[PDB]
Design a protein around this ligand. Structure first.
Ligand SMILES: *Cc1cc2c(cc1C)nc1c(=O)[nH]c(=O)nc-1n2C[C@H](O)[C@H](O)[C@H](O)COP(=O)(O)OP(=O)(O)OC[C@H]1O[C@@H](n2cnc3c(N)ncnc32)[C@H](O)[C@@H]1O
Ligand SMILES: *Cc1cc2c(cc1C)nc1c(=O)[nH]c(=O)nc-1n2C[C@H](O)[C@H](O)[C@H](O)COP(=O)(O)OP(=O)(O)OC[C@H]1O[C@@H](n2cnc3c(N)ncnc32)[C@H](O)[C@@H]1O
Ligand SMILES: O=C(O)/C=C/C(=O)O
Ligand SMILES: O=C(O)/C=C/C(=O)O
Ligand code: NA
Ligand code: NA
Lengths: 655, 655
């Protein structure tokens, strides 16, 4: 038997995984990072929007702080987030940016002087004072009033990922790629590591550790149309689910992006619309103004996606051999503007769409983009399975709830990497594990037997046909608009698809470097993940954040102010077990109310919300009257935890 | 913490360790072989005499079989051996030779025709029939009537070691050199591996395994004068002893060689005397005939060493700046004979002694050569500490007792490697271990702390001065001739030396590649081993095999027909704890009697021996009368165990 030991095992080499590995390796814990691919190629590298952090350096960022970022995050989540977690996040995001700047990330900087900027309310000029020169800049992204999205020109995710990966190399972290975790090793409710398949040699190996952290990213590829890399298939989510102990949170909470290029899904940054981009239909008609006379194309991202689909259903969509879509017109912004501020989007349209955005329109359609759902953890990042932690998009730390803020996800990856990293480090250094070879052998032999069964299967089902049907079902029934009747149909077909996945037969019999065998075991995992998403959507009879039920259009704070917890205790069951974790209003700093975007009064008010709100107004008044600062007030409303290393305040330009 | 896992951990890369590793690796168990040095440089490489095995191919080997080899072995051991083990050995030695021949070992072969040979009783010509041509040859070695010592010209140990090492490379065994086991990891009476110090980097690593085997060789270097390589210091013996559970067997049983070159200890093969070599004193007087009128220089090796020392004590020794010695004269054998049959010994004397043996005499003196004592095991090779096995010279499997047959030790290394290898393999595949990180950390941190304490010690003792004094004490008081008064003195000084070893101070503070630090932790271990040898000799008031007590010249089968078991349960005690394992005469195939060499009636007969002897004669008579073969008779006298793979009979030329 092949066994590899390390003190801290990290599954996933994206921003979250690598940053957590820095946290453990720096304190002397031997750590291994496993990844399907070279870590610098992780999906995190594709982020071009930027990272949200309340620095308050620039003119449009002036006055920004933890409280404003916090409020944007909670209201954005439509109150589905754990507010204590959101607080931990907002207070640490500024330090993440500054640590990355220290590690060489080339953040775009502010230069003194006037600036030609777009505000879309007063597209006047912006002036940056001399005392702001040379500090980290920020731009308008995510719909926040205060511009706090930091960026390194047009490749933020790229530079951030490279810096963290390089720090891992500096520290001697063992980075082992083309390695896939296919099962978690657990006994007595504790996680002791993972069974890993070497993608090159086919070897099945047991990686044991005192603590294991899953930072495997999102599960967007269960959808046919997604902005996600082809490796974002949620197998990390599935291995946690297959332990029958760890639970998945809000898997039905999936966010879509309104303007990905159709049908590839290659992202066309929000900056297109933010700069003045126009959405048009089959007749070239600018339609957003018809639905949003006021906000128009500058409406909430959430709203734009919905209107686009509505317009398509009204029969104004553009027919295509790949389906229906709409048009994005940025040529109206001028050729000079595109070749200086949108030079990247220009290359994308030319390279893949074979068009020049300065002359022709780009085909677009809303597509899956971010996975709010994930492995459920406490505030420390630990799952129900002891010793198993999760961070990044793969987790449901839940600072996002049912709608993540644009710019908050790459921010969360590094922030969680830092915070969960500390708690993960503490766990690995303080816990003592009992590694029974009997258990290791059971799990390893169990997967070797499984690979053999797949290679010898005389089944007649085609793995790709099954996978493709799964993706169509998800796109057609679990998209922007959902309803009970279609969701019931989806759950039934997915369950049928799952059962047929076991009758798959492959042509290539080799155990090494076999992409066919890879699909053979990944697809069944994806189907189970899809079932959690679909079933979760079916049972959640309300409309919250990104989850929109046409048959239940209102947010129900009375019966649904909770979080969906999915599990798969019995390996024989063909549907996921769903339970619910109630959100205690008494522990909220901001009581449930209007989210800001969408129709008003579109939510069933909960009496407990009114009580808490009053209680909050009271506490604020008294404390604010006694000349108490925002910090002491925050503490009295909702105290939260933070590792000692990050409990310090964030200095700002103007203190 | 650094941890390495394998199913089968082998400590020692000599013939025994490597052969055992072949046994485990061939059945799919991941195995690691740790060694202080590249494995092909192990002491096993120095064997030039040959390997004993009852093939019966040659004329002088005609009629030889397991029974004759068995009898030579038991009588040679002066009845201190476990006869069942000796049986396991003799029946397997023939297969070891044949397996090695299959692996390419270039055994010297028989060619048809007459041959100029020395018999020393009738130095006539020997004829080899045509049906013997091309089969494995054998020579006169070890004083056995039947010539059964196989050899590959003059480098038998060398070719054997290389073949086994190469098989390990073929099988993918992980060979990790410049790695030293400094402690065994154990809990609840079970061995889970060893703490290892990387000699190059200084890293302390835990090697965990389901089973651990120690094949670390002899402890000859505790003596000033020894034929052993400088790495034969018995640290393997010491780490087993330091667990406080494993016991060491007959540590006082040390064998000397009569003709090593003085004062280097470079071995001058027994062939010198066997061919007609003459021992002379200070006046050039051939003295052996004076002590052994009959056998003369062709007397038992055991007897030659004793007479040489006796002659020296009578004042006929040659004075030298390194001590007293005697002369070996082979020039009388002729120049032509030396440059064809003893070309090797000629090179040795010229290369190191700066003399031509065909013209001048070689300085010689008896010196420590083989370690019969070692880690005590059952017949399977397992020690009292469960999961810990031992094989080769490092063990006391005890097929040797108080006197090993010349040629039986390289034979045992491979044979035990085969047999203990099978049982070791079975244990590793069938047992299930509970590896607690709490325990691993305790042992690893314990040794890191120890290395640090050695580097920071402000002691003023000199490690080399202590080591050298230990070696002088052993040579002066625990050599060929021993007595209570001197042994008491030795035990006292050694105990004093041990206590002072703790106040050693070293100059070089680095933790990596530090030969001074190496001596700092090895010497204390050697001292504990030396104490087991010295104390064991002091308490054993009898003369048996190689252990000669001048104050107790007789073999005592009444009070000493047993085996000395040494342990060190309390890490505070400064002397070893000695217990005794009694040899059951009822389980002996050959009852105690005359050993063949030395004075007759020099043993206190035990009544139980007489009873058993009669019982044996009776069983033999009845069975032999009923036309029963030697096999059935053997079974009725003393049944023994053997792995299924080796329970087959040995085909011979003449069946
Ligand atoms: C898709 C996307 C997302 C995105 C974005 C643009 C695109 C095209 N722009 C963003 C932006 O401007 N601002 C922002 O805040 N977020 C933006 N996002 C989303 C964001 O980039 C992601 O949420 C974030 O990068 C996620 O980071 P995370 O560290 O969690 O995950 P990852 O980078 O995807 O890496 C996952 C790693 O896991 C390995 N893996 C996966 N499964 C396995 C198994 N089974 N075994 C072993 N390793 C596994 C992957 O190989 C990878 O390294
Ligand atoms: C010294 C000698 C012995 C000898 C002989 C000639 C000489 C000069 N001629 C012989 C002969 O003709 N016929 C015969 O039957 N025996 C003869 N012998 C004795 C015989 O060679 C030995 O008994 C035999 O070779 C012993 O084999 P074994 O496999 O037991 O041991 P080894 O070869 O000495 O190797 C020991 C290994 O252990 C490693 N080691 C030791 N301590 C440690 C620690 N602490 N950690 C890690 N590794 C360790 C050594 O490095 C080595 O590889
Ligand atoms: O439009 C983009 O660049 C990113 C959008 C998002 O992360 O939501
Ligand atoms: O004389 C030698 O070559 C070996 C002697 C021995 O192994 O006893
Ligand atoms: Na998530
Ligand atoms: Na021994």
């Amino acid at each position: 038997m092949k066994v590899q030991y390390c003190d801290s095992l990290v599954i996933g080499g994206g921003l979250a995984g690598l940053r957590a590995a820095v946290a453990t390796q720096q304190k002397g814990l031997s750590t291994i990072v496993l990844s399907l691919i070279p870590v610098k190629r992780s999906h995190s590298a594709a982020a071009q929007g930027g990272m949200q952090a309340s620095l308050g350096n620039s003119k449009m960022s002036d006055g920004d702080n933890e409280d404003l970022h916090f409020m944007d995050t909670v209201k954005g989540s439509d109150w589905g987030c754990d507010q204590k977690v959101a607080r931990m996040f907002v207070n640490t995001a500024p330090k993440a940016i500054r640590e990355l700047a220290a590690w060489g990330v080339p953040w775009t900087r502010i230069h003194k002087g006037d600036r030609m900027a777009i505000i879309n309310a007063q597209k006047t000029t912006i002036t940056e004072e001399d005392f702001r020169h040379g500090l980290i800049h920020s731009r308008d992204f995510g719909g926040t009033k205060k511009w706090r999205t930091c960026y390194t020109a047009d490749a933020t995710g790229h530079t951030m990922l490279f810096a963290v990966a390089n720090e891992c190399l500096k520290l001697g972290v063992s980075i082992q790629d083309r390695k896939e975790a296919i099962a978690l090793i657990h006994q007595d409710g504790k996680c002791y590591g993972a069974v890993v398949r070497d993608l090159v040699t086919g070897d099945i190996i047991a990686y044991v550790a005192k603590g294991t952290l899953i930072a495997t990213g999102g599960y967007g590829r269960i959808y046919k149309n997604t902005t996600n890399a082809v490796v974002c298939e949620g197998t990390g989510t599935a291995i946690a689910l297959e332990t029958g102990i760890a639970q998945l949170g809000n898997m039905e909470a999936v966010q879509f992006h309104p303007t990905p290029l159709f049908p590839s899904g290659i992202l066309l940054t929000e900056g297109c619309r933010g700069d003045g981009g126009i959405l048009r239909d089959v007749d070239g008609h600018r339609f957003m103004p018809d639905y949003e006379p006021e906000k128009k194309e500058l409406a909430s991202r959430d709203v734009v996606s919905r209107r686009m689909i509505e317009h398509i259903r009204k029969g104004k969509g553009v027919q295509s051999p790949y389906g229906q879509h709409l048009w994005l017109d940025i040529s109206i912004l001028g050729r000079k503007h595109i070749e200086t501020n949108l030079r990247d989007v220009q290359e994308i349209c030319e390279y893949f769409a074979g068009i020049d955005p300065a002359e022709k329109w780009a085909p677009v359609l809303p597509m899956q983009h971010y996975s709010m759902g994930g492995i459920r953890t406490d505030y420390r990042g630990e799952a129900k399975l002891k010793g198993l932690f999760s961070a990044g998009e793969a987790a449901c730390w839940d600072m996002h709830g049912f709608n993540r803020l644009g710019g908050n996800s790459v921010s969360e990856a590094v922030v969680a990497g830092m915070i969960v990293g500390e708690y993960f480090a503490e766990h690995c250094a303080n816990t003592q594990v009992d590694l029974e070879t009997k258990t290791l052998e059971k799990f390893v032999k169990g997967q070797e037997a499984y690979m053999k069964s797949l290679v010898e299967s005389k089944g007649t089902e085609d793995v790709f046909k099954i996978k493709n049907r799964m993706k169509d079902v998800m796109d057609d029934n679990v998209g922007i608009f959902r309803d009970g009747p279609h969701l019931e149909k989806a759950v039934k077909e997915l369950e049928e698809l799952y059962k047929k996945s076991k009758n798959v037969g492959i042509k290539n019999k080799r155990l090494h470097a076999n992409p066919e065998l890879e699909e053979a075991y990944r697809v069944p995992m994806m189907l189970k993940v899809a079932l959690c998403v679909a079933k979760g959507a079916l049972d959640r009879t309300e409309s919250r954040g990104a989850h929109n039920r046409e048959d239940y259009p209102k947010r129900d704070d009375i019966n649904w102010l909770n979080r969906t917890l999915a599990s798969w205790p019995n390996p024989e069951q063909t549907l996921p077990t769903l339970e619910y974790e109630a959100l205690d209003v008494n522990e909220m700093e901001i009581a449930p109310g209007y989210r800001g975007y969408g129709a008003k009064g579109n939510y069933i008010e909960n009496p407990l919300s009114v009580k808490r709100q009053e209680e909050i107004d009271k506490i604020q008044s008294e404390l604010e009257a006694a000349g108490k600062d925002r910090h002491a007030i925050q503490e009295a409303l909702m105290p939260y935890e933070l590792p000692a290393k990050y409990k310090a305040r964030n200095e700002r330009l103007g203190d």
